[PDB]
């Protein structure tokens, strides 16, 4: 019932709805699978890189400010608990 409890919410989303739904499942799976936050960032980048070819930069922290140059429609912003799963593919 932990998956129901997390209720991850995407504050800002710039991606197709079908792709966005897939990201939520990966984000929930990554948090339980990874013992530490640093492991979560590596797991999200590896899964997305395998799923979609390109260069992916992912940063997750309790408090942070980010300005980035990402390919249009490849940036999805979702916040679960105190962790921000942010991925932006840059060509």
């Amino acid at each position: 019932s932990h998956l129901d409890k997390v209720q991850p919410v995407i504050k800002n989303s710039d991606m197709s709805v079908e792709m966005q739904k897939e990201v939520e499942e990966v984000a929930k799976k990554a948090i339980d699978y990874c013992n530490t936050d640093k492991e979560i960032a590596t797991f999200i980048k590896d899964d997305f890189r395998s799923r979609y070819h390109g260069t992916w930069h992912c940063i997750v922290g309790r408090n942070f400010g980010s300005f980035v140059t990402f390919e249009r429609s490849y940036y999805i912003y979702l916040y679960v608990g105190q962790l921000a799963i942010l991925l932006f593919k840059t060509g």
């Binding site: 936050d37 590596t42 922290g61």
Partner: protein, 49 residues
């Protein structure tokens, strides 16, 4: 008989042409590496301390 060496002079003229050459050039951007950095208040304070 009307044509004469002084009467008609023939000169052969050609234009210098550089020899055609075939060369292959390959360019490949600088190697890029993946870097993961985790920052915490205690770690920032420890370096500062």
């Amino acid at each position: 008989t009307l044509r004469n060496k002084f009467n008609y002079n023939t000169r052969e003229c050609q234009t210098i042409n550089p020899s055609i050459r075939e060369r292959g050039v390959s360019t490949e951007p600088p190697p890029s590496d993946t870097i993961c950095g985790n920052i915490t208040q205690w770690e920032i304070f420890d370096a500062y301390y």
